[PDB]
Amino acid sequence: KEKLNAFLVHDNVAFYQGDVDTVVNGVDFDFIVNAANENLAHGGGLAKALDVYTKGKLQRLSKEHIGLAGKVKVGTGVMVECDSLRIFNVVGPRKGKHERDLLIKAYNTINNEQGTPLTPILSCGIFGIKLETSLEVLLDVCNTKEVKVFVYTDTEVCKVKDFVSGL
């Protein structure tokens, strides 16, 4: 019944390519993860595209609760319901000394949030973390329930395939 076919499945993890409108409409999932920030201020990248999608109910239901007490740590997420679209706003780390520990935390919050996640690969946008490093942590942490992962570009799709080949 799923409209968009995964370009790759590895163990419990299925990989899709599309923009936000494409994956929200084509993929079966309980909630989508927004790769976000402390004040929840949507740039900028996937966060923008999601807020355009919403719109911008995401930013409004945002702050709101940021807002209500009162800002979000690296990460740690804030679920919002935008119509029939549940958005789990997760703060991934910036590149840095503690990026692997904070990446572990972020994916662990995703994995422990009830339902099938649709997540991007955290922090490999302007945060500067290598896609393959964030994907390594994603697979290590998200190792039981089914999880769906999306990327946008043909470059990203190749990096995912090559990394998964090496496994």
UniProtKB/Swiss-Prot annotation:
Positions spanned in the full protein: 1269 to 1435 of 4085
Residue ranges of domain Macro in the record: 1-167
Lineage: Viruses, Riboviria, Orthornavirae, Pisuviricota, Pisoniviricetes
UniProt membrane topology term: Multi-pass membrane protein
Protein name: Non-structural protein 3
Species for this entry: Human coronavirus 229E (HCoV-229E)
Subcellular location: Host membrane
Signal peptide positions on this chain: none
